[PDB]
Amino acid sequence: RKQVSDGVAHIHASFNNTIVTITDRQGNALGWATAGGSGFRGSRKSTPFAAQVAAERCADAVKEYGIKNLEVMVKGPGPGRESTIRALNAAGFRITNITDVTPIPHXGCRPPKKRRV
Amino acid sequence: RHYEIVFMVHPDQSEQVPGMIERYTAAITGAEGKIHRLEDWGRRQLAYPINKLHKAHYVLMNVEAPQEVIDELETTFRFNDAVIRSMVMRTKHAVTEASP
Amino acid sequence: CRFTAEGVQEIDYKDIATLKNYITESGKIVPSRITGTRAKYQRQLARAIKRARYLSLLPYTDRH
Amino acid sequence: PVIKVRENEPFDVALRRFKRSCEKAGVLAEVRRREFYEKPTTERKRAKASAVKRH
Amino acid sequence: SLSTEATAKIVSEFGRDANDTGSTEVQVALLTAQINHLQGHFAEHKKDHHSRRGLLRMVSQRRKLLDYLKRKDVARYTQLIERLGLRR
Amino acid sequence: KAXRAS
Amino acid sequence: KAXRAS
Amino acid sequence: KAXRAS
Amino acid sequence: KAXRAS
Amino acid sequence: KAXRAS
RNA sequence: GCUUGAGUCUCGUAGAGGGGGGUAGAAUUCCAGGUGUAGCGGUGAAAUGCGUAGAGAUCUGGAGGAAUACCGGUGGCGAAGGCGGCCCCCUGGACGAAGACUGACGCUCAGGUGCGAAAGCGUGGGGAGCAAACAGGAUUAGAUACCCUGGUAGUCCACGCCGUAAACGAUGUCGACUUGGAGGUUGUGCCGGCGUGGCUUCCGGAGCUAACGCGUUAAGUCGACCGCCUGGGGAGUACGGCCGCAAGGUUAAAACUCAAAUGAAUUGACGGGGG
RNA sequence: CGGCCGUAACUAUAACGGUCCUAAGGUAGCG
Ligand SMILES: C[C@H]1O[C@H](O[C@H]2[C@H](O)[C@@H](O)[C@@H](O)[C@H](O)[C@@H]2O)[C@@H](N)C[C@@H]1NC(=N)C(=O)O
Ligand SMILES: [K+]
Ligand SMILES: [K+]
Ligand SMILES: [K+]
Ligand SMILES: [K+]
Ligand SMILES: [K+]
Ligand SMILES: [K+]
Ligand SMILES: [Mg+2]
Ligand SMILES: [Mg+2]
Ligand SMILES: [Mg+2]
Ligand SMILES: [Mg+2]
Ligand SMILES: [Mg+2]
Ligand SMILES: [Mg+2]
Ligand SMILES: [Mg+2]
Ligand SMILES: [Mg+2]
Ligand SMILES: [Mg+2]
Ligand SMILES: [Mg+2]
Ligand SMILES: [Mg+2]
Ligand SMILES: [Mg+2]
Ligand SMILES: [Mg+2]
């Protein structure tokens, strides 16, 4: 219920899906939405548009908090990296920071085998 | 052999550092060693946190010593909880010029 | 190459103002092809940055 | 890639500065490079081929 | 390797001069010194195969120098292997 | 179908 | 080998 | 000439 | 059909 | 130089 | 006897050369919490799978293993296999500059001996990620596959074994000689310029080559020594020996059978190759 | 730790196909 004001938008842009989570500055989730949960399955789910709608729905999920400022953490290679940030600015949030938080190993773990498609 | 010891102290134990320097340099000199350079850099902002600390008290030494007493100082650093981090490096020649 | 022009004998890990020129905003070591550093100094520079990163005089990443 | 947005600036400029900084770090190339394991033989083979074509 | 002073001692002992570094006696004495020193290394470091190849070169080189000295001068050979404590 | 052949 | 599954 | 091979 | 194989 | 090539 | 081959000594240089120990940061996974709520994940599309017993996401703390982003380079080092964070200890080789020293001490090497990727094997550890086998889901006429979700050996460590790879430059080692050009890397003498060593990449001349190509790092011109070949298949198989815990390795036939097999290049045609 | 039914150009058998059921249908080896 009580007013956050300064939020953080965490964008998890995988190749298959986009998860938009809005938190307070200490990373407690306020609301979230996903491209897969915004009426987009399969090919449509992995599009910039489905990430935009996910962003818009996530803004509606946290409207009761009255968030003004967002610092944007972007993660992953996905099609919905850019469109989510644009949707949030369009949803009336003030974008103060934009950060790439994509995890990059300094070597570590062996990735899966290459797909022989 | 010549060595360039750096060690970092938990910034609470800044008071203990003149004590520490006296003790470690005494261990060098009492085995026929030299302190070529010695620079208490004091407390600096760390580039990243170490054991939840955002600062540490850096001390540079350049030392000519036998291997065994330097090995012993590395063990002293290990078992001292105040010393958060240390680097001992071989140098070719004795370093005395003012560090950066 | 600044290091051959200045005649640096060895690049010092403690000389952080110098080393900050040879890392990106990310913290990554810049290629010799970009900076124009000589191969021999690039190796010294790499070692120096890695020692400075160990001592927390430089960051490994811009995201600790 | 870490952009702090400055006072009196369009978002499209601020965002394009983020887009340009991610291109610089090569974070998306890095992610695509680490999706699947390349064998050392394959990694050396492509490294060889990249060198021969540049020449 | 042998230190500067350990090398110079051996040149003094087995050589005809301070500068007689080429003498077969000096060469064999230097090889013997380092072969003996490295017995400690390889007792500890049994799987240091790369370094051991260097040791086996020292052994082979010493064998060739001793084989040379034997057929060149048997008296000096007999003296040298007695001093250094070699079986042959 | 099925391991069994199909 | 097996047909039956093994 | 297609599906069949060409 | 045939003996030879057909 | 002798084994290395001279 | 000699010093020109081969060595030794002095000073310095570069290096992922090796062995041992320590340590750092990023990331994955797991565990325990906080916030939060209906999806997540995956694919060509799915489904299996995971999730209201609260996942996924996000934040905090913890555990553990493995590998070291960037630097990074037809860059470097090593006999080959190979070797990549940082630090220390032990240690091998190479190279250069000036001399000084020994005085043919050399080259090659059947047998012998050692080293030798990966997988594999033994004993004891370890096990994050990955992943033969295996399980389930798809695809399909079928699909014991490719794709998906899992997942055991294994991959990691110690010690011992195995001894093989397209272990390749498909090019044995050593020495000499024979137009050039452009680079990389690492020394060094001299006043950015001039040289002069080592290692290395590409192009190309004569010559060589069936051709393709090789071309001072020769596949050119020669010399020393070794290994190996003698049509294709049967077969690197059988039998015997030797080696191995085993897997197997190594040495290695014959009958019978065919009139070919093969290399390179040429013109087409063809390609779910490109323009 | 399974049945059924069909299928090879002499016959025979069935590598192969279809089918019903199962928690899974007995593998190596041996007979
Ligand atoms: C795509 C298929 O490709 C291959 O089979 C091809 C076949 O499908 C026909 O197009 C022609 O006969 C080709 O000449 C064949 O090579 C063969 N590798 C089997 C493959 N099919 C599948 N994997 C599958 O059906 O599944
Ligand atoms: K300590
Ligand atoms: K011989
Ligand atoms: K496992
Ligand atoms: K021709
Ligand atoms: K045999
Ligand atoms: K025959
Ligand atoms: Mg070394
Ligand atoms: Mg193995
Ligand atoms: Mg094992
Ligand atoms: Mg898996
Ligand atoms: Mg799989
Ligand atoms: Mg073979
Ligand atoms: Mg190889
Ligand atoms: Mg090859
Ligand atoms: Mg061969
Ligand atoms: Mg080499
Ligand atoms: Mg050529
Ligand atoms: Mg020929
Ligand atoms: Mg056999």
Q: What is D5-51 written as a DSSP string?
A: PPSS--HHHHHHHHHHHHHHHTHHHHHHHTSSPPPHHHHHHHHHHHH
CA–CA separation, A95 and D6 (whole Å): 10
Taking CA atoms, C40 is separated from C1, C34, C58, E45, in Å, by: 11, 15, 22, 32
Nearest-angstrom CA–CA distance, E13 and E17: 9
Contact G4 F5 (CB under 8 A): no
Strand pairing partners for A10?
Answer: A21, A73
Are residues B8 and B86 in contact, defined by beta-carbon separation less than 8 angstroms? Answer: yes
Distance CA B100, CA E5 (A): 37
Q: Taking the mean position of all CA atoms in its chain, how far away is CA E77?
A: 13
* CA contacts within 13 A on the Cβ side of D9: 16
- Between CA E24 and CA E67 the distance in angstroms is 10
Helix or strand (DSSP H, E) at B36: strand B34-50
Conformational region of residue J3, where left means phi above 0, alpha means psi within -120 to 50, and beta covers everything else: left
How far is the first Cα of chain E from the last one, in angstroms, to the nearest whole number? 24
Residue E61, CA atoms < 13 Å, CB-side half-sphere: 17
Q: Which residue has the tokens 């390889």?
A: E42
Q: Report helix, strand or coil for B35.
A: strand
Order of strands across the sheet that contains A69-75: A29-34, A18-24, A6-13, A69-75, A94-100, D2-4
| Count of structural domains, chain E | 1
Cα dist. B42→A48, B17, C18, C54, E45 in Å?
51, 9, 21, 18, 42
B window 39-68: Cβ near strand K (< 7 A): 48, 50, 52, 67
The amino acid present at C15, given as its one-letter code, is: D
- Residue E41 near residue E51, CB atoms below 8 Å: yes
User: Is the separation of the CB atoms in A88 and A95 below 8 Å?
Assistant: yes
Alpha-carbon distance of B5 to B28, in angstroms, equals 12
Domain that holds residue C18: 1-64
Q: Tell the residue number behind the tokens 């850096």, with chain if given.
A: B58
Listed as ranges, the nucleotides of chain K within 7 A of a protein C-beta are 5-11, 13-20, 23-28, 34-46, 55-61, 65-75, 78-81, 85-96, 100-106, 114-116, 128-132, 135, 139-144, 146-148, 159-160, 173-176, 184-187, 192, 197-200, 202, 217, 270-272
Contact C28, D25 (CB under 8 A): yes
Count of domains observed in chain B: 1
3-class SS of residue C2: helix
Give a yes or no: residue B64 inside a domain. yes
Q: How many angstroms is C1' of K195 away from CA of A51? A: 67
Residue type, A43: S
Kind and range of the H or E run holding E11: helix E4-14
| Helical (H) or strand (E) element with D2 | strand D2-4
- Choose the mutation target among C18, C56, C62, C63 for the interface with B, i.e. most B CBs under 10 Å: C56
Q: Which positions of strand L lie within 7 Å of protein CB atoms?
A: 2, 8-11, 15-19, 24-28
**In angstroms, how far is CA A2 from the centroid of its own chain?**
23
Contacts of C19 (CB under 8 A, 6+ apart): C11, C13, C45, C48, C49, C52, C58
- Whether residue A93 contacts residue A6, with contact meaning beta carbons closer than 8 Å, is answered with no
The two tokens of residue C43 are 């190796």
> Which letter does DSSP use for residue A61 in this model?
H
CB half-sphere exposure, D23, CA atoms < 13 A: 7
User: E74 by DSSP, 3-state: which?
Assistant: helix
Length D49 CA → K117 C1' (Å) = 23
Q: Which of D3, D33, D6, D35 is closest to D19 using CA atoms?
A: D3
Q: Residue B37 is which amino acid?
A: R
Question: What domain range is B24 assigned to?
Answer: 1-91
* Identity of residue A112: P
Task: Indicate the DSSP class of residue A112.
Answer: P
Do A68 and A94 touch, CB atoms closer than 8 A?
Answer: yes
Q: How far is the CA of E60 from the C1' of K161 (A)?
A: 29
Q: Are B96 and B55 in contact (CB under 8 A)?
A: no
Q: Which helix (H) or strand (E) holds A17?
A: none
- Do C55 and B89 make contact, defined as CB atoms within 8 angstroms? no
d(CA A100, CA A116): 31
The yes-or-no reply on J/E contact (3 CB pairs or more, < 8 Å) is no
Nearest one of A104, A47, A43 to D35, comparing CA atoms: A104
Nearest-angstrom CA–CA distance, B12 and B19: 14
Among B67, B59, B58, residue whose Cα is nearest residue B3 = B67
Instruction: Please give the torsion angle defined by the CA atoms of residues B61, B64, B65 and B67, in that order, rounded to the nearest 10 degrees.
Output: 90
Domain of residue E25: give its range: 1-88
Helix (H) / strand (E) element for A63: namely none
Residue among A36, A7, A39, A42 at smallest CA distance from A19: A36
Is there a domain that residue B99 lies in?
A: no
In a domain, B78, yes or no: yes
Neighboring chain B residues of C54 at a CB cutoff of 8 Å? 85, 87
Q: Which residues sit directly before a break in chain J (C to N > 2.5 Å)?
A: 1, 4
Residue showing tokens 């499209």: D12
Question: How many structural domains does chain C have?
Answer: 1
Length of chain H: 6
Distances in Å between the alpha carbon of D9 and those of A87, A92, C38, E16, E45? 18, 16, 40, 87, 65
β-pairing, A94-100 vs A29-34, is unpaired
Q: Which chains touch A (3 or more CB pairs under 8 A)?
A: C, D
Residues F1-6, buried b or exposed e (16+ Cβ, 10 A)? eeeeee
Give me the sign of the Cα torsion angle A37, A41, A46, A48: negative
G chain contacts of residue F4, beta-carbon cutoff 8 Å: 3-5
Angle at A11 between CA A8 and CA A12, to 5 degrees: 140
How far does the CA of D40 sit from the C1' of K125, in Å?
Answer: 29
